């Protein structure tokens, strides 16, 4: 058997103090707890969220928190820093998918939490570097735990739109396969399909078009369709694919 990483004395102390005040909102927001809570947060982010975070150490911390109290586990895992980021945001963004998996396994993450920038961990996953087959299953696990159709505070973009705009075909297939709606329009009326036509992703256009109920007729706020956009972007091959679709 492997000897588990233990919480630092500062962290154990803070967590035991938290356990004893967590159900008392007066105590929790008081001056007397401020140093405790800052220490708690400081330690958790140092251990869980740096690029060089040790996955085993994070997993052992999670177990240690649960053993102290399930309420302590929920509390720490869901801490957001001053950028509004949780450990789930940072671990998705650093492509540290071992840690992403350990966090989902705790079954307490607020996976729909929007950071200050306005994005959820699912949106961040759309742009993350996925190297292995194992990692994509972890990503699809993430998609299944949250709302894949949530809209960013910035322009109302979805994870699907972000994945399309980057040409990440792996990722688009994942989102679609976990229930991402093709027809959602951002704040300006733009669809995923329109994103695909701006960026010239012919393979992604074919994939979106192949989805049941994919609407090529939708117009953005200035009456532009995917077809009208495609022609202006110079993408003849996309335009003929789009034209055949809206006239099938």
């Amino acid at each position: 058997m492997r000897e588990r990483y233990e919480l630092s004395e500062k962290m154990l102390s803070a967590c035991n103090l938290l356990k004893n005040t967590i159900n008392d909102p007066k105590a929790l927001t008081s001056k007397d707890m401020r140093f405790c809570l800052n220490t708690l947060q400081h330690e958790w982010f140092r251990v869980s969220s740096q690029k060089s975070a040790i996955p085993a150490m994070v997993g052992d911390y999670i177990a240690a928190f649960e053993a102290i109290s399930p309420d302590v586990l929920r509390y720490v895992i869901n801490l957001a820093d001053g950028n509004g980021n949780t450990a789930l945001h940072y671990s998705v963004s650093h492509s540290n998918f071992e840690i992403v998996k350990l966090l989902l396994d705790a079954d307490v993450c607020n996976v729909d939490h929007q950071n200050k920038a306005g994005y959820t961990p699912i949106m961040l996953a759309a742009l993350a570097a996925v190297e292995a087959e194992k990692d994509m299953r972890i990503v699809e696990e993430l998609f299944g735990c949250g709302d894949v159709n949530a809209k960013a505070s910035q322009a109302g973009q979805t994870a699907l739109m972000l994945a399309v705009s980057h040409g990440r075909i792996d990722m688009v297939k994942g989102l679609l396969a976990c229930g991402a709606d093709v027809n959602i329009q951002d704040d300006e009326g733009s669809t995923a399909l329109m994103c695909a036509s701006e960026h010239g992703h012919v393979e992604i256009v074919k994939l979106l078009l192949a989805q049941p109920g994919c609407n090529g007729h939708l117009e953005d706020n200035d009456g532009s369709t995917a077809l009208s956009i495609a022609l202006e972007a110079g993408h003849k091959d996309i335009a003929v694919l789009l034209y055949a679709h809206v006239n099938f």
């Binding site: 950028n83 963004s93 993350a128 910035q154 300006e188």
Partner: peptide, 15 residues
């Protein structure tokens, strides 16, 4: 428009 922008990993993470 947002549909034409290429958003980076860091634009998603930090305001």
């Amino acid at each position: 428009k947002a549909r034409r922008r290429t958003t980076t990993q860091m634009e998603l993470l930090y305001a």
